Amino acid sequence: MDLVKNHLMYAVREEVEILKEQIRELVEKNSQLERENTLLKTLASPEQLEKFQSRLSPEEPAPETPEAPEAPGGSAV
């Protein structure tokens, strides 16, 4: 027989049908998440937020941090 060891793209029956459908579903889920992420990346690329950056509106100063020095470390440096 030489066809079973040929249509492995139909199943590559030889390792595990579950891991084969898992890698096929991981590549199909990654491709669907790559197009879904690229679709939301392009949709949120131009204008689809409430302005915050320097392109739409400059705001949201500093990252998630308070306005006071309260970190531990008497002489760590």
Place this chain on the structure above:
Amino acid sequence: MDLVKNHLMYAVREEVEILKEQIRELVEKNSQLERENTLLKTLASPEQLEKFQSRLSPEEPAPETPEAPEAPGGSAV
């Protein structure tokens, strides 16, 4: 591409490492696509998580759970 089963004597590649590395790279790439797609889904579409706090995970489903006896669904309306 029909090449790993050629030098296999030189090592015998194809063990469960080629399937664990394929599912690990597929889950690591899908994971980066899930953290980037989730951050892009909440950035472009922030209205999909208010459900709770407002900064952790947009989703969390809910089966037939009990609600408060009044009219609304606990915190809403």
